[PDB]
Amino acid sequence: VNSFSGYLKLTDNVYIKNADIVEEAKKVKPTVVVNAANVYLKHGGGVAGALNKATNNAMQVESDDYIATNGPLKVGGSCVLSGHNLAKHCLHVVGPNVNKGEDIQLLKSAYENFNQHEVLLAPLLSAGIFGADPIHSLRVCVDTVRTNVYLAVFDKNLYDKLVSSFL
Ligand SMILES: CCc1c[nH]c2ncnc(NN3C(=O)CC[C@@H]3C)c12
Ligand SMILES: [Cl-]
């Protein structure tokens, strides 16, 4: 038993809710919150901008030090950093940005990072401002992640579409 509440069980291991991931994180304080990161960990907008704002920019400060030491992530890759006031850890995961021509097949690689964590709160990777169809992102998630994932979808109209088209 865990502290997540109000989710639709899509499968044995995937759950979904209409909520802002930032508010879910503040309420639950999960072990792992997933950020929809870019390779430079420049958290300007979308999920990343919202999470970073909620940390009062501490996420960005930590991220800039990470990049200065290690260089950029790979598309499809990830790193574990602090979750600051939102979670124990933040798993920064880079899904492909189809607006930049990046291979949508890399979305499966991106979701594979989730399997290194038993339970995660997460957004739909590559969707939103990253340009991919959220319906596709949800399907890849279900077909790739085997650990317990709680997906927060802020857009209510999209949530309804994701639910209705699922089975
Ligand atoms: C609007 C930005 C945002 C803030 N907090 C969020 N929490 C969850 N998802 C979010 N955005 N997204 C959707 O709602 C559908 C896919 C895309 C990632 C957000
Ligand atoms: Cl977004």
- Considering only CA atoms, which of 43, 41, 39 is closest in space to residue 22? 43
Q: Is 152 in the pocket of ligand 1 (CB under 6 A)?
A: yes
Distance CA 35, CA 21 (A): 9
Return the residues preceding each gap in the chain, C–N over 2.5 A, or none: none
Chain centroid to CA 116: 14
Domain residue ranges in the chain: 8-163
Distance CA 11, CA 99 (A): 30
Distance CA 3, CA 155 (A): 23
**Structure method:** X-ray
Q: How many CB atoms lie within 10 A of CB 79?
A: 18
Considering every ligand atom shown, identify the ligand nearest to the alpha carbon of residue 157 and give its number. Answer: 1
In sequence order, the 6+-apart residues with CB closer than 8 A to the CB of 91 are 32, 33, 34, 35, 78, 79, 80, 113, 114, 117, 120
Indicate the CATH number for domain 8-163: 3.40.220.10
Considering every ligand atom shown, identify the ligand nearest to the alpha carbon of residue 23 and give its number. Answer: 1
- Considering only CA atoms, which of 27, 35, 19, 33 is closest in space to residue 3? 27
Alpha helices (H) along 3-118: 21-28, 46-54, 58-70, 106-112
Distance CA 19, CA 5 (A): 11
Distance CA 129, CA 131 (A): 5
- Looking only at the bridges linking them, the beta strands covering 89-94 and 78-82 are antiparallel
From 99, 130, 155, 159, mutation site for ligand 1 pocket: most ligand atoms within 8 A of C-beta: 155
Q: Is 133 in the pocket of ligand 1 (CB under 6 A)?
A: no
Q: How many CB atoms lie within 10 A of CB 112?
A: 16
User: How many whole angstroms from 156 Cα to the centroid of ligand 2?
Assistant: 13
Phi-psi category of 94—alpha, beta or left, where left has phi over 0 and alpha has psi -120 to 50? beta
